[PDB]
Amino acid sequence: ARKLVEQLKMEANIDRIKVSKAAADLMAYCEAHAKEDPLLTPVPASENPFR
Amino acid sequence: RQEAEQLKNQIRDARKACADATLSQITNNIDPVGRIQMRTRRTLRGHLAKIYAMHWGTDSRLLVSASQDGKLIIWDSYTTNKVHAIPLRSSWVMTCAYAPSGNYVACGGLDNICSIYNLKTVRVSRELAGHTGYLSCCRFLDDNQIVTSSGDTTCALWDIETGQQTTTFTGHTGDVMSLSLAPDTRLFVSGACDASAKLWDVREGMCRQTFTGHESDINAICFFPNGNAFATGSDDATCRLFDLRADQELMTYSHDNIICGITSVSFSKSGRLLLAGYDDFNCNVWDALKADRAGVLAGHDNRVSCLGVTDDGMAVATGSWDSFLKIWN
Amino acid sequence: EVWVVGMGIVMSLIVLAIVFGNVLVITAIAKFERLQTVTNYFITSLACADLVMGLAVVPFGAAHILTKTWTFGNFWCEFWTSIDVLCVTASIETLCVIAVDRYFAITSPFKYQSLLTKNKARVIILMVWIVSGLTSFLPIQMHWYRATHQEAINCYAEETCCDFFTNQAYAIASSIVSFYVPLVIMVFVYSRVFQEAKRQLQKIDKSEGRFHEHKALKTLGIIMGTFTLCWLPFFIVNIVHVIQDNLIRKEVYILLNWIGYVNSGFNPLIYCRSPDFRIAFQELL
Amino acid sequence: RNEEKAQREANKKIEKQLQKDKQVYRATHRLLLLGAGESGKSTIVKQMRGIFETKFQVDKVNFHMFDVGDERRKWIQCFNDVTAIIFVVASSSYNMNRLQEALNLFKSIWNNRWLRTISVILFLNKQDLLAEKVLAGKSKIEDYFPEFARYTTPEDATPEDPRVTRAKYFIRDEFLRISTASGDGRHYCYPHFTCAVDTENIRRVFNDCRDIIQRMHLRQYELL
Numbered sequence: 001a002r003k004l005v006e007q008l009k010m011e012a013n014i015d016r017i018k019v020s021k022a023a024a025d026l027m028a029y030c031e032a033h034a035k036e037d038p039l040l041t042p043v044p045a046s047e048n049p050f051r
Numbered sequence: 052r053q054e055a056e057q058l059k060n061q062i063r064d065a066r067k068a069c070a071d072a073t074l075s076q077i078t079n080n081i082d083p084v085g086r087i088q089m090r091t092r093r094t095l096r097g098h099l100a101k102i103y104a105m106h107w108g109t110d111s112r113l114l115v116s117a118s119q120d121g122k123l124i125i126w127d128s129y130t131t132n133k134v135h136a137i138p139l140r141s142s143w144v145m146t147c148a149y150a151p152s153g154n155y156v157a158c159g160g161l162d163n164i165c166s167i168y169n170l171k172t173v174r175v176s177r178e179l180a181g182h183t184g185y186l187s188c189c190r191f192l193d194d195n196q197i198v199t200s201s202g203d204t205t206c207a208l209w210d211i212e213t214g215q216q217t218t219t220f221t222g223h224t225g226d227v228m229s230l231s232l233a234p235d236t237r238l239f240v241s242g243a244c245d246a247s248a249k250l251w252d253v254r255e256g257m258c259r260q261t262f263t264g265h266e267s268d269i270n271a272i273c274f275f276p277n278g279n280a281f282a283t284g285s286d287d288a289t290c291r292l293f294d295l296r297a298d299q300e301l302m303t304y305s306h307d308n309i310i311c312g313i314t315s316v317s318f319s320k321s322g323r324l325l326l327a328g329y330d331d332f333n334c335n336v337w338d339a340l341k342a343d344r345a346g347v348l349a350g351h352d353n354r355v356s357c358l359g360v361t362d363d364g365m366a367v368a369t370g371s372w373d374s375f376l377k378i379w380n
Numbered sequence: 381e382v383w384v385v386g387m388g389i390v391m392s393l394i395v396l397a398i399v400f401g402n403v404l405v406i407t408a409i410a411k412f413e414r415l416q417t418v419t420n421y422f423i424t425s426l427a428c429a430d431l432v433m434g435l436a437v438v439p440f441g442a443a444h445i446l447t448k449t450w451t452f453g454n455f456w457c458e459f460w461t462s463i464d465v466l467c468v469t470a471s472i473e474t475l476c477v478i479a480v481d482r483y484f485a486i487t488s489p490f491k492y493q494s495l496l497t498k499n500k501a502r503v504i505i506l507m508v509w510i511v512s513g514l515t516s517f518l519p520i521q522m523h524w525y526r527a528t529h530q531e532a533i534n535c536y537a538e539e540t541c542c543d544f545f546t547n548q549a550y551a552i553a554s555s556i557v558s559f560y561v562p563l564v565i566m567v568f569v570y571s572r573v574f575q576e577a578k579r580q581l582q583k584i585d586k587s588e589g590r591f592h593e594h595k596a597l598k599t600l601g602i603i604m605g606t607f608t609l610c611w612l613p614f615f616i617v618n619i620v621h622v623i624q625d626n627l628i629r630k631e632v633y634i635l636l637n638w639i640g641y642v643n644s645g646f647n648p649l650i651y652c653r654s655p656d657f658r659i660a661f662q663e664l665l
Numbered sequence: 666r667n668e669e670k671a672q673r674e675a676n677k678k679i680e681k682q683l684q685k686d687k688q689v690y691r692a693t694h695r696l697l698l699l700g701a702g703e704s705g706k707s708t709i710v711k712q713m714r715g716i717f718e719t720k721f722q723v724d725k726v727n728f729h730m731f732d733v734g735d736e737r738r739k740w741i742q743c744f745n746d747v748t749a750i751i752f753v754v755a756s757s758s759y760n761m762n763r764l765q766e767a768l769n770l771f772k773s774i775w776n777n778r779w780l781r782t783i784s785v786i787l788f789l790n791k792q793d794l795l796a797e798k799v800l801a802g803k804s805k806i807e808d809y810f811p812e813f814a815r816y817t818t819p820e821d822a823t824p825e826d827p828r829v830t831r832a833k834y835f836i837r838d839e840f841l842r843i844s845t846a847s848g849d850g851r852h853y854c855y856p857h858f859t860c861a862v863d864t865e866n867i868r869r870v871f872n873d874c875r876d877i878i879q880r881m882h883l884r885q886y887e888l889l
């Protein structure tokens with residue numbers, strides 16, 4: 001049982017950041033890379049290989 | 052041995068104190084993406100029976116699917132014509148994979164064996180054995196090392212050159228149903244049948260963190276393109292978005308009109324759209340940030356079991372039990 | 381006057397129903413891949429035959445009845461007669477084929493897959509259509525069927541009256557080929573099917589009766605009864621009006637013939653009640 | 666240029682091969698051999714004449730049996746397209762409760778969501794041992810299963826002492842009570858009595874499969 005007890009102590013000792021910073025980072029990444037996805041933005045039929 | 056409860060309470064208090072504001076609160080004011088309409092572009096036929104798995108190639112041109120008739124077929128999406136057809140020793144397959152180098156194809160099923168084929172020579176190359184249960188998923192980490200997860204609550208990292216396990220990952224209680232690799236191929240996760248998702252380290256070989264948001268078995272899992280988040284799907288018709296750094300979930304995607312299970316989850320290239328397949332014979336397109344539906348991909352007569360998005364993110368392919376594959380754009 | 385008027389409305393309604401049901405069935409079969417089964421090729425052949433008959437021969441027949449004078453040439457009279465005979469004699473052998481298919485499916489379950497294949501179905505349909513068209517166009521477009529009676533000579537001479545007059549041989553041969561031969565096959569097949577169903581029901585009752593023939597009787601009854609009622613009187617008056625001179629008046633002959641045409645408006649209501657067809661119709665209008 | 670034509674030729678060859686494989690796929694009938702632990706599964710298979718496959722044909726009909734080899738069953742969704750299921754249970758192990766575990770397993774199998782249209786063939790092995798313990802022992806099923814007191818043989822059923830037949834019918838009806846509860850007319854069960862020395866199992870499976878296919882076809886055409 002000591003093997004299980006060791007892991008619980010091991011996983012506890014990690015630094016964490018607030019939810020605000022993580023949400024801001026996710027939003028920033030999504031807004032930055034938003035102009036480079038064919039699914040969201042319908043590209044012209046010239047560049048579409050499936051038409 | 053009552054210290055275990057003390058550590059769990061310590062974890063709970065730290066997680067509660069970490070939270071400051073909900074994800075919906077921050078992202079409320081952004082404009083929506085609106086309705087997204089997708090139409091079928093190609094239809095691939097030729098499988099005698101139902102399909103369980105598929106995996107796009109790294110060149111966004113070739114894909115491989117495995118059916119219960121005991122046959123692997125490599126398609127060509129651009130010209131909807133086959134290239135290869137590989138018979139199998141056993142007719143039960145539950146997974147498939149495509150090597151990053153475009154030279155090897157692996158498949159494993161109800162027999163407790165993972166097989167590897169050599170496309171550019173089509174005969175069997177290696178047979179990896181040692182698992183005590185059926186395999187669920189397998190992904191090519193490189194051209195000579197492969198990571199697999201089986202039904203005996205274990206995961207292993209193999210060596211193709213010698214065919215022997217290098218590191219074994221243990222800790223789960225229920226069966227393991229899926230896994231996915233990080234963008235830098237340094238970490239990987241797994242979703243089990245005990246409603247828990249864990250984060251491993253390939254080099255170290257020891258578990259790091261654990262998430263316990265769901266209430267039933269987990270059937271799918273996938274990383275965010277950023278590499279710091281991942282979303283799962285379960286039998287209670289819910290998809291939850293977790294986060295490594297904060298170490299708790301941020302958002303749940305649920306609706307009152309669905310009571311079915313979830314079989315596949317995938318992201319888009321920008322990460323704005325989350326695509327999931329259900330048992331209602333159709334797929335749904337969710338909004339990652341605002342948690343609002345934005346379209347439906349219907350057209351399959353039976354349940355959807357596979358789904359994948361190209362590396363370039365130009366199209367999405369869905370496979371179903373109706374022995375058909377479709378390409379949506 | 382009023383009678384002439386009324387006849388029109390109901391005749392147009394009959395034409396509209398006959399066209400609409402068949403076109404809806406054909407569209408439902410073609411649009412969806414869930415219905416592209418081997419058994420559905422015979423049904424779509426029957427639907428095409430009924431649609432062609434209803435669209436081609438019914439309107440011109442109605443015009444002839446109402447105007448009491450045919451306003452086209454002799455060539456078009458012969459052409460219309462040939463199309464009518466072809467459609468009528470091709471809309472029954474398909475039902476015979478369907479009955480044989482159900483017989484083979486029920487009686488020999490272990491060999492149904494090998495016996496029937498997508499390749500052989502096309503051969504069977506082509507053979508049915510060819511043998512149907514061989515007895516219609518060949519002896520009508522050529523003048524074997526024509527009679528030599530005094531009335532028939534004037535009828536064939538005039539360019540305004542287009543009536544049906546035939547000798548004994550052609551009438552007997554056409555009736556035997558079209559109706560009487562494909563009836564004994566139906567009777568035998570459905571008798572065997574009913575016997576098998578009764579045996580299975582008795583087996584179930586003897587097996588688990590304590591804890592726990594209507595549907596089969598009703599299904600076979602409707603399937604046989606509608607067809608026999610629609611097509612049996614006409615194929616008896618056809619023979620008897622040639623056996624005996626002046627025995628049966630022309631008006632009742634035309635009435636019974638028109639009663640026969642109603643049958644094409646009921647096949648979609650009989651062979652297309654399956655849940656898959658119902659879902660397809662619900663999705664498509 | 667010519668690469669497209671070469672790919673077209675390769676596609677034609679692959680399609681030609683798949684068309685030939687389709688016939689042999691459609692010819693065979695599949696079965697799943699699912700039995701409780703220690704229930705005679707090994708013999709029945711052995712004396713007929715991580716996985717196991719069996720090939721045998723009767724009257725030029727190909728059959729193909731699979732034996733799986735976890736208390737939880739998540740892999741059972743893979744067997745929704747088989748012809749039938751062969752369930753093997755020991756009729757004499759009502760005191761060692763093994764019989765109650767078999768009943769619960771059968772109930773779990775019957776009412777599964779994915780197995781809504783799969784019939785079950787039931788084999789009741791170890792007739793000799795059950796008869797021996799029923800007739801030559803002081804122990805009685807009454808104690809182990811209480812309701813045994815009320816049941817009296819069905820008047821119609823055939824038969825030997827008047828106690829062994831009563832016990833066998835009690836067990837068979839305890840299974841049929843679960844069998845007839847739900848499922849409407851989509852799937853059925855065919856109980857059977859089998860010993861080790863019996864030699865007609867291969868014929869019984871053949872007859873049951875033929876009846877299953879006949880009943881499915883009859884129901885599809887609105888006749889049953």
Ligand SMILES: Nc1nc2c(ncn2[C@@H]2O[C@H](COP(=O)(O)OP(=O)(O)OP(=O)(O)O)[C@@H](O)[C@H]2O)c(=O)[nH]1
Pocket residue numbers: 700701702703704705706707708709790791792793794859860861862
């Ligand atoms: N006397 C007698 N013994 C039987 C009969 N059927 C099975 N047995 C015994 O049961 C044993 C085999 O059953 P088990 O070992 O419980 O199970 P198995 O069939 O070997 O394998 P599983 O069914 O997979 O557990 C054999 O040693 C047989 O002697 C029978 O009809 N009569």
Ligand SMILES: CN[C@@H]1CCc2c(ccc(O)c2O)[C@H]1O
Pocket residue numbers: 461464465468469544551554555558637
């Ligand atoms: C002009 N109407 C025709 C006349 C005789 C006839 C019909 C149909 C089938 C036949 O085998 C026939 O002999 C009728 O439709």
